């Protein structure tokens, strides 16, 4: 049993910048008995470093491994956008083998003026249940995007629910899907529905239009 600290956590760094990840151990561990792992957005963790010095067979030697006794540091000499992942330092030194809290690397490249689209309800769940409208915000950086629903030119309450996907391995961009489920009957005089987006991207709030 060894509780262990990690790096600050979320890190914003431009591509081509060195990244340092720390792994202090509350209890002393062997100078070379710790292994740094990397898990991609939605997948199984892949071994990056074993023994705190050696590299896993087929791992590009940007991911240098060092540190001994108490503090172990993983240093990524160059950064590409295919490094955005969660890194865990596991001390297979003691027992039971304690995984690290984990650090998240976010590669800081672009601000991606977003693309806003509406997908207004159609006559398949307007023939059962509760319909739902949706607002897609495809290709945008970073995660600082807020969408508020506008109904018949009147602002809406907190009955939304926004879901944002993780950055793509090559694209390194963040797409969104704010949803407004409604009572299946309530589509009478509310002629127009829209989502208002505020972003680093694009001067204005980019509102939209349904009519139909």
């Amino acid at each position: 049993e060894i509780v262990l600290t990690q790096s600050p956590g979320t890190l914003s760094l431009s591509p081509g910048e060195r990244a340092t990840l720390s792994c202090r151990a509350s209890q002393s561990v062997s100078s070379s008995y710790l292994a740094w792992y990397q898990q991609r957005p939605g997948q199984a963790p892949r071994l990056l470093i074993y023994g705190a010095s050696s590299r896993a067979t087929g791992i590009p030697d940007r991911f240098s491994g060092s540190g001994s006794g108490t503090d172990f540091t993983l240093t990524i000499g160059r950064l590409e956008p295919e490094d955005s992942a969660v890194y865990y330092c596991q001390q297979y030194g003691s027992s039971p083998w304690t995984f690290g809290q984990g650090t998240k690397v976010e590669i800081k490249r672009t601000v991606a003026a977003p693309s806003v689209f509406i997908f207004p309800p159609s006559d398949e769940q307007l023939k059962s249940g509760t319909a739902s409208v949706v607002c897609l915000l495809n290709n945008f950086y970073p995660r600082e995007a807020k969408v508020q629903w506008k109904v018949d030119n009147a602002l809406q309450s907190g009955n939304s629910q926004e879901s944002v996907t993780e950055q793509d391995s090559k694209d390194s961009t963040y797409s969104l899907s704010s949803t407004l489920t409604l009572s299946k009957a309530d589509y009478e005089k509310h002629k127009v529905y829209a989502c208002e987006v505020t972003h680093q991207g694009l001067s204005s709030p980019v509102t939209k239009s349904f009519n139909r």
């Binding site: 074993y50 949706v134 944002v164 797409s175 899907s177």
Partner: protein, 213 residues
């Protein structure tokens, strides 16, 4: 490559045999949803030896059938707090017990609420959109309870702009996720008879065609 089983939905007070098709141990590794990995146990089919962490001891039996070469856990006597994704991973021995190759993973979901079917929802592509680059269309999956539902387009062909959003809890324990794809094939479209969805608990598969309205 390590190929596992599929999302068991069990009831608080049940039993789950997660099967990892398997001189190499299998070590199992929990990960509570939105949390950080733990250790759960290790076996070697070559010797039949098994070892378990102290907390999970008296509730877990990790076995393997060396002849047919397939390893299993059996977390009997489990509570609602064990709803987590469980991985199987390859040992290396004594001083080299780092987890080399991993399994895809098998989300166990343990609470006596329900199992509900992926009611697929209208797509309805927007008319006046981009000038050809990205005509966005997506077939939505709402009203289902137990995750997973994988939704590939073109039964796993169109893999170049399939944006999938993580399921978010609705008013009921059910949650919903949305799938979208971008086509340059504006009018007509080549392949538009698409949207395969697989639900591991319900075992219900729905395929629908997209129409520009």
């Amino acid at each position: 490559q390590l190929v596992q089983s599929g999302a068991e939905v069990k009831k608080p007070g049940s039993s789950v045999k997660v099967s990892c098709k398997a001189s190499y141990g299998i070590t199992w590794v929990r990960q509570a949803p939105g949390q950080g990995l733990e250790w759960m146990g290790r076996i070697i089919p070559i010797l039949g030896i098994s070892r378990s962490v102290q907390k999970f001891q008296g509730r877990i039996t990790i076995t393997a059938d060396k002849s047919t070469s397939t390893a299993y856990m059996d977390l009997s006597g489990l509570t609602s707090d064990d709803t987590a994704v469980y991985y199987c991973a390859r040992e290396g021995g004594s001083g080299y017990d780092f987890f080399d190759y991993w399994g895809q993973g098998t989300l166990v979901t343990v609470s006596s609420a329900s199992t509900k079917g992926p009611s697929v929802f209208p797509l309805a592509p927007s008319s006046k959109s981009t000038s050809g680059g990205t005509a966005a269309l997506g077939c939505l999956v709402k009203d289902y309870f137990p995750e997973p539902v994988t939704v590939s387009w073109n039964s796993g062909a169109l893999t170049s702009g399939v944006h999938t959003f993580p399921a978010v809890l609705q008013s009921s324990g059910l949650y919903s996720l949305s799938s979208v794809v971008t086509v340059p094939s504006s009018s007509l479209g080549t392949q538009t008879y698409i949207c395969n969805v697989n639900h591991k608990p319900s075992n219900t598969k729905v395929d629908k065609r997209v129409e520009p309205k």
